Write a protein that binds this DNA or RNA. Sequence first.
RNA 1: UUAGGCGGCCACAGCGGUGGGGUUGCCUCCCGUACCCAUCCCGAACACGGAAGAUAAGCCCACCAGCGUUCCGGGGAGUACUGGAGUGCGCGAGCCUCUGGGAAACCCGGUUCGCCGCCACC
RNA 2: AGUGCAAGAGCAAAAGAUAGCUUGACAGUGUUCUUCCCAACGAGGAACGCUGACGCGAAAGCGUGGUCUAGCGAACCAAUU
RNA 3: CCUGUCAAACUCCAAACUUACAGACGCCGUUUGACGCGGGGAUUCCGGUGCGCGGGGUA
Lengths: 156, 140, 154, 95, 186
Amino acid sequence: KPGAMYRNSSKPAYTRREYISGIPGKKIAQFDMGNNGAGPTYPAQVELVVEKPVQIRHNALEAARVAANRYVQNSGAAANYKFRIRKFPFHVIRENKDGMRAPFGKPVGTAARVHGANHIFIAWVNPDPNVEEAWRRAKMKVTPTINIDSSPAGNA
Amino acid sequence: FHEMREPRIEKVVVHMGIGHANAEDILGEITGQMPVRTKAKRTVGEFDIREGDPIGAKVTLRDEMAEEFLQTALPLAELATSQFDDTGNFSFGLDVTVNLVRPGYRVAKRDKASRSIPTKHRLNPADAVAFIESTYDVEV
Amino acid sequence: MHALVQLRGEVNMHTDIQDTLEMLNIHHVNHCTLVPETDAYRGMVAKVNDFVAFGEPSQETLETVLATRAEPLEGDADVDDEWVAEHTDYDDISGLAFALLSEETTLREQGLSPTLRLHPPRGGHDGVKHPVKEGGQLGKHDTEGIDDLLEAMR
Amino acid sequence: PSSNGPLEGTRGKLKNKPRDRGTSPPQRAVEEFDDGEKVHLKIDPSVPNGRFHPRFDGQTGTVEGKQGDAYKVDIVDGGKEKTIIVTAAHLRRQE
Amino acid sequence: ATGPRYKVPMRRRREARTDYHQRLRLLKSGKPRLVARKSNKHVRAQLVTLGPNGDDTLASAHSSDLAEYGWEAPTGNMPSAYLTGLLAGLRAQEAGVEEAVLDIGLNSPTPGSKVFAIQEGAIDAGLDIPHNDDVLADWQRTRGAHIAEYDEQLEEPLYSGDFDAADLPEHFDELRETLLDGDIEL
RNA sequence: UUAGGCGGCCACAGCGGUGGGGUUGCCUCCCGUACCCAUCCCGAACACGGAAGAUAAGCCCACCAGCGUUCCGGGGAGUACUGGAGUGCGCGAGCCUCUGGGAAACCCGGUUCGCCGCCACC
RNA sequence: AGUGCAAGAGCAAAAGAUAGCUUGACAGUGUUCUUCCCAACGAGGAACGCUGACGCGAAAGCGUGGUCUAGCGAACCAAUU
RNA sequence: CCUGUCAAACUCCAAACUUACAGACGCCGUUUGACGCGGGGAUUCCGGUGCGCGGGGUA
Ligand SMILES: [Cl-]
Ligand SMILES: [Cl-]
Ligand SMILES: [Mg+2]
Ligand SMILES: [Mg+2]
Ligand SMILES: [Mg+2]
Ligand SMILES: [Mg+2]
Ligand SMILES: [Mg+2]
Ligand SMILES: [Mg+2]
Ligand SMILES: [Mg+2]
Ligand SMILES: [Mg+2]
Ligand code: NA
Ligand code: NA
Ligand code: NA
Ligand code: NA
Ligand code: NA
Ligand code: NA
């Protein structure tokens, strides 16, 4: 199913698991990537900034993350960098799969609500921005247009 | 300062935690005054499901009745240290507990304007060992 | 004291906004009233802010308008100096105007209609879809700003 | 509403902020009002008795006689006149 | 204490001085309260009314200012209590007070207790108070007979120096007698 | 208020901690069970009777801000949100301007270790 | 925590627990709110009185069933006081 | 200790705003009698749209 069905934040927040059952597990494998043993003790810090509030299905998060980290293997399986996806798919989504009678759908997935300007991804690297590239591929698999922003890094 | 800071025995509770009694009799003679029933709470597998139910007795002794008892109880006990309260108490043994404290305790036991005893005015394990050990026996 | 001029009609405007205009004695487009600057009056003009034009007019302007569009509580009679002197506490229009501006009296108190029914603005006004700060004609105006509108509607 | 009992939708108005929790001071439960006085109606979550229908919480009526220790306040619901039987515990002097 | 949500009891509850549930039932009568209070050495009796910023004491009596009338005996006993009640009851009358209800605070409703002696005193002073006669002591005990008899089992004076050796419930009568006519502050 | 009783507001008063105070007078702890009364067992408590001793508790007095709380300055912030208006922008989601209101978190610095009423009293 | 049972709310010298005692889960008749916001409409419900008789308590007082909001039924006919 | 996120059926907080009563101005009423009271006669109980706020629904 298309992102068109769930990319807008027009519905009420629906996240109370105490009143919702049968919610599908998330496809997001990890949130901390790279040298998670080390702390953000890096010279450079780039972030992927979403430019519009939207809803991002755990589907897109996993594909976006994989495509970025899977690529960050331009530095090696145990390379020197740490990657972080700060958002979690809290918002439960339904689908009305009778016609419009008794239409409250059934849980079919989850999605994370990101507001325009938040960073969904943050990487930490030494002057070796291959990460900038890992993100051109990341925002490629998420609905919104995105801004690739660098913070600690006046080494231009 | 002292005199009103020096420990003293306030009640010695002798109780026999049985599991369902005929035992009161011996408590009455060992102490010198009537025992009190020991009801239990909660329903449990040791065929002890009855809420209100005699399951042992106790006896709270005060003043001479407490000394005249310890003047034989203590001798039948050896232990000391670690086996002492953080408030200067200790139980040994059929159980025999000795509650110790200093002169102004009624402040915490009375009805009107009651209050809790300040930590400083409390009795420490150490200050307790001294008092008792200094009364016919030895510590550890 | 501010000069109030309704520049937008009644159709589709909130009722509670319309009643306000009515409480301020304005019942038609281009109708103008003079309102003291008080807490109570201030709240009212603010509520009516999007369908009117208001501001403090200059002595002169007020005089021009008074002379040109003032009316007795009843009748055609022209409100000229003579009228003013033979009917009011003051001796001439200028005297009246000053009093109004300094908020010492009111058009009723002097047996005059609370409303100065103005003429459409000669040359057209700046638009009723945008405020002054945006090139429009709605909202608070400059004393020079209000004067132009009032004068154009003399 | 899914139901129509008196306490429907009263979760808020009949609950105390954690700190105002517990038995309330007796001073205001004994307060005496005179006929004609204006009194604000507000239920004390902590005080069970002497209550009035939650829908009137917020009203400001006029004391006009009492019934037992309870007072009879006149209020106007929308455009209807009504009399409310309420104890001091739930009233406050206006001004 | 612990957090923003924590609930701190009322000051007079923390101090374990006022029983607010009883207080409210007391304030129900709409009558003044006859506050009966004790101390190891003394006994106090007040007639309190309700006020805007707190209670108003319109009349009081303390077992200490009892000597001010000829008391030469201890002041933490039964005869003491009654008299202190009668004294406060009288000053009460002077103040224009006609009735009241007995507030014994945190004390126990034990029959023949000093608070009830306080209540009997105030009543005889002329104050109208809701009571129950057979919860009161039997007059003799009020007189202080129980103490005289106790000194009979002498061998050593019950009173260290004080007054008398065999004590005097008669001293009691002389005083009640005194309080029942004229004299200052009454 | 050189120590008390009854309260109002019910943490500005809570939690924790330091120092000081009783020679006759007050509160206590304290001493003690013939009585009224009392412990499903204990004068522990409750109740009654009393001063040999003490200021160590409590309590009263002076003070500390580490925690909790109340209010204030500056910053966050005229941000977030919002009542009224718009032939302003945007494929749209949505945004912007004018007008009237206006926050929360958090940081830094102050404040707060109760206030007040009635009665009694070297 | 507990308070019979949904959910939300109330409650700590208690509305909870224990003990003891008691039958107010009483008869009569109302006021008011609710049912039905506003705004007419029955049964039902609740709050708050009074009259009478009682329970407990030293007493103020508390008890018009269970802390509060669910647990309810017209006319005709029968049986019953 | 540090570090990453949330709530229609969460709340240590908390608007704009809505709302009871009162006073003030305004407007209105006392020959156009308002507010209110009593009675006669209805029609009406398929609605729709814009904007704001919504809930459902891919729409
Ligand atoms: Cl009501
Ligand atoms: Cl007392
Ligand atoms: Mg005319
Ligand atoms: Mg032209
Ligand atoms: Mg134009
Ligand atoms: Mg000291
Ligand atoms: Mg009830
Ligand atoms: Mg039939
Ligand atoms: Mg039958
Ligand atoms: Mg609303
Ligand atoms: Na079907
Ligand atoms: Na994209
Ligand atoms: Na309360
Ligand atoms: Na038993
Ligand atoms: Na001391
Ligand atoms: Na009915």
